Amino acid sequence: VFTTVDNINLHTQVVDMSMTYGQQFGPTYLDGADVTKIKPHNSHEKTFYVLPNDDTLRVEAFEYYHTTDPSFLGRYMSALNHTKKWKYPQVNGLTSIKWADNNCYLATALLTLQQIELKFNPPALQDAYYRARAGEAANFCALILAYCNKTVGELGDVRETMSYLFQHANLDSCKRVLNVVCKTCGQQQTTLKGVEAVMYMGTLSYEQFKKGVQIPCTCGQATKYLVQQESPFVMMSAPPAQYELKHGTFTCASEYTGNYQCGHYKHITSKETLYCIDGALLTKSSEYKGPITDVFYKENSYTTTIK
Numbered sequence: 001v002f003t004t005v006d007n008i009n010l011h012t013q014v015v016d017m018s019m020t021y022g023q024q025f026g027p028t029y030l031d032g033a034d035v036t037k038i039k040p041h042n043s044h045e046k047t048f049y050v051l052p053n054d055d056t057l058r059v060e061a062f063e064y065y066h067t068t069d070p071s072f073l074g075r076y077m078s079a080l081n082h083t084k085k086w087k088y089p090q091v092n093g094l095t096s097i098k099w100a101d102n103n104c105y106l107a108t109a110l111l112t113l114q115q116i117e118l119k120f121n122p123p124a125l126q127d128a129y130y131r132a133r134a135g136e137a138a139n140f141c142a143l144i145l146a147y148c149n150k151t152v153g154e155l156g157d158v159r160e161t162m163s164y165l166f167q168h169a170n171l172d173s174c175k176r177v178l179n180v181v182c183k184t185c186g187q188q189q190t191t192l193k194g195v196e197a198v199m200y201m202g203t204l205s206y207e208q209f210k211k212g213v214q215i216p217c218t219c220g221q222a223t224k225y226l227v228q229q230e231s232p233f234v235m236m237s238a239p240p241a242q243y244e245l246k247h248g249t250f251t252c253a254s255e256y257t258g259n260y261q262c263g264h265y266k267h268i269t270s271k272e273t274l275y276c277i278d279g280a281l282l283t284k285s286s287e288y289k290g291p292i293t294d295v296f297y298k299e300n301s302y303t304t305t306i307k
């Protein structure tokens with residue numbers, strides 16, 4: 001019998017058939033199911049996931065997941081019991097998810113991550129991220145739910161899910177410098193780094209951010225524009241409104257229709273033409289107009305031209 005916390009460093013233990021796994025190993029999981037109350041069986045003699053009970057397992061658990069929350073393995077194994085049953089079709093060369101248990105926001109996020117450049121700091125996230133691009137995205141979706149502290153069936157927001165994931169990614173080299181102009185106060189330059197340098201809530205178009213956005217001032221309206229952007233991408237979010245998506249001006253977008261929270265997501269991507277991925281469904285179009293809430297753009301190093 002093998003016990004592990006990372007499926008890498010395995011620990012071989014000797015088991016019997018009298019006591020259950022709970023008494024011998026603590027809460028133990030096979031695949032995604034809970035074999036805590038289940039007694040050992042013949043075909044079980046394989047590797048089992050156990051909650052860390054010593055310092056060696058606690059250290060290995062942090063090295064793989066970068067978390068010390070004792071409930072993390074439980075939330076992760078509970079989500080995996082559903083995600084392993086989902087279907088992950090290949091739509092337009094991308095891995096999507098067939099609709100199941102309100103996974104519309106998870107599918108839009110999964111398709112978005114396969115199109116932007118991202119390096120995850122937790123090794124467990126990075127390893128499953130690679131398998132997700134290759135078609136095996138069950139572990140990756142389950143880990144996303146665990147890190148975001150969300151459960152299967154819960155209604156998720158794509159912008160909130162991306163932000164949670166961005167905080168577990170290497171965005172240290174990302175830098176955004178803004179300039180807020182105000183006729184009374186003057187000019188103030190602010191520098192953002194990391195997660196805050198790649199996301200903005202207000203407008204959907206990256207060009208309006210470069211031209212200037214009407215932002216309030218402490219004295220009372222100013223204008224904020226982008227001076228310099230050094231990031232592999234930018235995420236522009238705005239409340240759901242009708243927007244015009246043109247081929248070649250963006251990478252991918254998030255469509256939200258329906259009421260607040262209990263609504264549905266769809267993924268729009270710009271290839272040789274505009275593609276609409278709704279789980280397992282694909283529709284193409286030369287132009288698009290609909291309710292868009294998130295737009296992702298590509299970037300490397302931008303520097304403004306206004307004094």
Ligand SMILES: Cc1ccc(OCCN(C)C)cc1C(=O)N[C@H](C)c1cc(-c2cnn(C)c2)cc(-c2cnn(C(C)C)c2)c1
Pocket residue numbers: 155156157160201239240256258259260261262263293
């Ligand atoms: C699907 C879903 C799941 C979870 C969730 O959790 C939010 C709670 N969270 C704070 C923890 C939200 C959503 C969700 O509805 N998302 C969508 C994208 C959404 C729709 C609407 C909206 C308004 N009218 N109608 C008919 C729809 C408004 C907005 C909106 C507005 N302003 N903001 C910014 C500033 C925070 C966002 C977001």
Ligand SMILES: [Cl-]
Pocket residue numbers: 066067
């Ligand atoms: Cl960490």
Ligand SMILES: [Cl-]
Pocket residue numbers: 066121122167168169
């Ligand atoms: Cl992390």
Ligand SMILES: [Cl-]
Pocket residue numbers: 260
């Ligand atoms: Cl609202």
Ligand SMILES: [Cl-]
Pocket residue numbers: 248249250251296297298299
């Ligand atoms: Cl772009």
Ligand SMILES: [Zn+2]
Pocket residue numbers: 066121122
């Ligand atoms: Zn970490």
Ligand SMILES: [Zn+2]
Pocket residue numbers: 082101152
């Ligand atoms: Zn389910």
Ligand SMILES: [Zn+2]
Pocket residue numbers: 081082083085
């Ligand atoms: Zn299920």
Ligand SMILES: [Zn+2]
Pocket residue numbers: 182183184185186217218219220222
């Ligand atoms: Zn002012």
Ligand SMILES: [Zn+2]
Pocket residue numbers: 102103104105263264265
């Ligand atoms: Zn849905």
